[PDB]
Design a protein around this ligand. Structure first.
Ligand SMILES: [Zn+2]
Ligand SMILES: [Zn+2]
Length: 49
């Protein structure tokens, strides 16, 4: 079956736990850690699991 895998754009690893998706860029996501490192600063992001 089709499964949409969420891969972190900061570490290239699959996002588990909390997903920080950019509201500006189409289809851009960070894991909780890369988000903690403050990557992709200038864009607003949605925070949800
Ligand atoms: Zn990451
Ligand atoms: Zn962005």
């Amino acid at each position: 079956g089709e499964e949409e895998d969420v891969i972190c754009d900061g570490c290239n690893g699959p996002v588990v736990g909390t997903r920080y998706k950019c509201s500006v860029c189409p289809d851009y996501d960070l894991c909780s850690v890369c988000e903690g490192k403050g990557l992709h600063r200038g864009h607003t992001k949605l925070a949800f699991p």
